[PDB]
């Protein structure tokens, strides 16, 4: 499957944060043997009026291998059957952010479409005042309640400029067109440690992600 696993990708991520529209597009690459991703995005609607960190972690688990071979995400890309994704994040200050994903594949190139709705961020808070500066390591837990569904949960924390943490909880649901292989369903839960990096201006960002799946 080396030729059918992903090597390059692009993302169109769009929607609104507090009812204000944004839209970004750009190109990336990654390594499906070790989880790595890197992505450049540029705004198509002018300066971003909120912290670009709010788009992290949302800005391609097709790059995630499992400990003993392909992940289900990889398997579903390689056989063309695919999957869809929905995530909800609920923040300590009562805000929410939803995102849904659809993908298409052209050989080893992935095209992603991510539709975002962020609601209820306080005007004064670190999102709307562009005061987020980093994100903690994050441990995700994946369970498989049936042969076509993965549920992933995690707690998330950003660091802010004034040394506070800004916390949220997330639940992600994956819907597979074809049943997942039996070994995945037997070997649950699966955990994944990830780390993200972001450098940004008001119009452009450079993102990186590292991922490592494990049981015990
Ligand atoms: Cl996830």
């Amino acid at each position: 499957n080396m030729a059918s696993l992903p090597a390059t990708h692009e993302l169109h991520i769009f929607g609104s944060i507090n009812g204000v529209d944004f839209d970004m597009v750009g190109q990336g690459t990654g390594n499906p043997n070790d989880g790595y991703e890197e992505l450049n995005l540029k705004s198509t609607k002018g300066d971003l009026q909120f912290s670009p960190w709010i788009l992290v972690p949302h800005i391609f688990h097709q790059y995630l291998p499992y400990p003993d071979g392909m992940s289900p995400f990889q398997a579903a890309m390689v056989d063309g059957s695919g999957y869809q994704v929905h995530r909800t994040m609920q923040f300590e200050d009562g805000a929410s952010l939803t995102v849904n994903y659809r993908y298409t594949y052209e050989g080893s190139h992935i095209k992603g479409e991510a539709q975002v709705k962020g609601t209820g961020f306080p005007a004064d808070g670190p999102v709307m005042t562009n005061s987020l500066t980093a994100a903690d390591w994050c441990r995700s837990k994946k369970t498989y309640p049936n042969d076509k569904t993965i549920i992933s949960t995690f707690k998330w924390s950003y660091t802010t400029g004034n040394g506070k943490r800004y916390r949220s909880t997330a639940r992600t649901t994956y819907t597979f067109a074809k049943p997942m292989a039996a070994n995945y369903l037997k070997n649950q839960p699966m955990y994944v440690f990830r780390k993200t990096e972001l450098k940004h201006s008001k119009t452009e960002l450079n993102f990186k992600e590292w991922q490592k799946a494990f049981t015990d």
Side-chain angles (χ1 to χ4, degrees):
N1 303 133
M2 207 221 74
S4 299
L5 289 170
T8 61
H9 67 292
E10 62 186 81
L11 181 63
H12 174 221
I13 184 162
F14 62 96
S16 60
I17 300 297
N18 285 2
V20 186
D21 293 350
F22 76 93
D23 187 285
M24 309 192 79
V25 296
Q27 295 298 324
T29 61
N31 187 341
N33 195 250
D34 71 13
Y36 183 69
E37 310 172 17
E38 67 176 53
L39 179 67
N40 173 267
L41 296 172
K42 293 183 178 69
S43 176
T44 70
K45 290 178 175 286
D47 291 356
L48 300 171
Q49 303 292 83
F50 54 81
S51 177
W53 280 97
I54 209 62
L55 305 181
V56 175
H58 318 296
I59 59 178
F60 289 88
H61 293 353
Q62 305 90 340
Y63 290 113
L64 177 69
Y66 268 15
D68 291 346
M70 286 191 290
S71 66
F73 317 100
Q74 289 179 334
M77 171 174 174
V78 167
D79 74 11
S81 62
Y83 63 95
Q84 302 172 340
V85 187
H86 176 82
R87 180 179 304 112
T88 302
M89 191 166 262
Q90 291 174 296
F91 296 81
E92 63 170 66
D93 57 5
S96 63
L97 185 153
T98 62
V99 55
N100 71 76
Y101 299 82
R102 299 293 183 272
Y103 307 97
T104 61
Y105 306 111
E106 294 160 12
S108 58
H109 190 61
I110 309 169
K111 293 175 170 173
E113 294 283 329
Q115 177 179 44
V116 173
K117 182 79 164 65
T119 307
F121 294 102
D124 54 345
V127 173
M128 301 313 297
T129 64
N130 194 198
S131 304
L132 303 177
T133 58
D136 286 1
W137 280 91
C138 176
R139 186 173 169 152
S140 295
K141 176 183 182 188
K142 295 183 184 301
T143 64
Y144 309 68
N146 61 53
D147 66 6
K148 284 174 177 185
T149 309
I150 299 175
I151 303 298
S152 185
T153 56
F154 59 88
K155 294 188 184 296
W156 182 268
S157 189
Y158 304 95
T159 299
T160 69
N162 68 350
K164 305 295 97 172
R165 291 196 138 78
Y166 182 55
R167 301 181 192 282
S168 56
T169 60
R171 190 188 174 267
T172 310
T173 71
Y174 296 84
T175 291
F176 288 80
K178 290 294 163 74
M180 286 176 277
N183 65 294
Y184 298 129
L185 310 185
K186 188 169 93 283
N187 289 306
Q188 63 171 300
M190 180 62 68
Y191 300 97
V192 191
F193 276 124
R194 301 190 178 85
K195 192 60 162 68
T196 64
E197 173 185 310
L198 191 72
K199 295 179 190 295
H200 68 270
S201 69
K202 298 283 275 282
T203 59
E204 181 168 8
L205 60 83
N206 285 305
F207 170 75
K208 302 180 167 60
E209 180 170 309
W210 297 263
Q211 318 176 73
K212 178 57 175 174
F214 66 106
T215 68
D216 260 14

